[PDB]
Design a binder for this molecule. Structure first.
Ligand SMILES: [Zn+2]
Ligand SMILES: [Zn+2]
Length: 109
């Protein structure tokens, strides 16, 4: 019942993202955030609730996509601007909505 607590917190974060000025130009934000929340939760999150190297690795093996230690560390820092070793839901939403196309995003679709 951890993944229900994780869902609820992301649901609340979406309530914030629905009003954040940063995304107020987005059309169909409710359906976008719902889609992003669903996708983020497909990852085995660490226990702050962020995607770390381990979760990224497990997703890569899930998707049948080969990535090296260093390609993965770079996929993360590309998405977090080098600020952090893990991808938070915020960074994940910024990636999904950004026009810059990160390797992690390309790998999703
Ligand atoms: Zn609209
Ligand atoms: Zn709608």
């Amino acid at each position: 019942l951890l993944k229900a607590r994780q869902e609820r917190r992301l649901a609340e974060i979406n309530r914030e993202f629905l009003c954040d000025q940063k995304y107020s130009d987005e059309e169909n934000l409710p359906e976008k955030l719902t889609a992003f929340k669903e996708k983020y939760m497909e990852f085995d999150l660490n226990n702050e609730g962020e995607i770390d190297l381990m979760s990224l690795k497990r997703m890569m093996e899930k998707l049948g996509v080969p990535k090296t230690h260093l390609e993965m560390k770079k996929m993360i820092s590309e998405v977090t601007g080098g600020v952090s070793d893990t991808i938070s839901y915020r960074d994940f939403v910024n990636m999904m909505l950004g026009k810059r196309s990160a390797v992690l995003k390309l790998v999703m679709m």
